């Protein structure tokens, strides 16, 4: 009925970053999260091992810098009433919206999650929801504009998702709350 789903990725440990922000680590504790959807770029099993301490169900797709080449390129999952698609995004050449709507139809999902830009974004179009959690470490990218650490928590109940977007802004964890309802 009620499911908390953690969505994160682009940690880039240890090449670009060595850990998640300590304030995030203090919030991410076992016993709460039912599933973890990861956009990839961990990049090593050490960060995979960390996620498995948080939840018994971890789903990951292959980022362009992951060490594990067995990770699938894309994943579709059904959680409650929602079909959720997952892809790292370094394959999306114009996060372009005509491409995302196409991917939404190809995966046949209510929610499409992707990463690779390290910029948190979320929007709704025609009763489909598109999420990018950003980088949970605030890892640098090419030509960046600052790059705030961020991750996403989805609160899924019946046909409503309430998404909480956690961001490390200055010295504080700050949150935005999003509602997504499907017909």
């Amino acid at each position: 009925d009620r499911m908390l789903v953690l969505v994160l990725g682009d940690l880039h440990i240890p090449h670009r970053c060595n850990s998640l922000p300590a304030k995030f680590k203090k919030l991410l504790v076992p016993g709460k999260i039912q599933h973890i959807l990861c956009t990839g770029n961990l990049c090593t099993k050490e960060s995979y091992d960390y996620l498995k301490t948080l939840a018994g169900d971890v789903h990951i797709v292959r980022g362009d810098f992951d060490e594990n080449l067995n990770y699938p390129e894309q994943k579709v999952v059904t959680v409650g009433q929602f079909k959720i698609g997952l892809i790292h995004g370094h394959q999306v050449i114009p996060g372009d919206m005509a491409s995302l709507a196409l991917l939404q139809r190809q995966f046949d999902v209510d929610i499409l999650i992707s990463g690779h830009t390290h910029k948190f974004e979320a929007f709704e179009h025609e009763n489909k929801f598109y999420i990018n959690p950003g980088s949970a470490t605030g890892a640098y990218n090419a030509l960046e504009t600052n790059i705030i650490p961020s991750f996403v928590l989805m609160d899924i109940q019946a046909s409503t998702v309430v998404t909480y977007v956690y961001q490390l802004i200055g010295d504080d964890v700050k949150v935005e709350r999003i509602e997504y309802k499907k017909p």
């Binding site: 908390l4 919030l27 709460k32 928590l153 609160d155 909480y164 977007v165 956690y166 961001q167 802004i169 504080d172 964890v173 700050k174 949150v175 935005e176 709350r177």
Partner: peptide, 16 residues
């Protein structure tokens, strides 16, 4: 202002 969340109470990140 502030927002209650499953992981605790935090400041809102909204620019307004």
């Amino acid at each position: 202002x502030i927002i209650d969340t499953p992981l605790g109470v935090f400041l809102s990140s909204l620019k307004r």
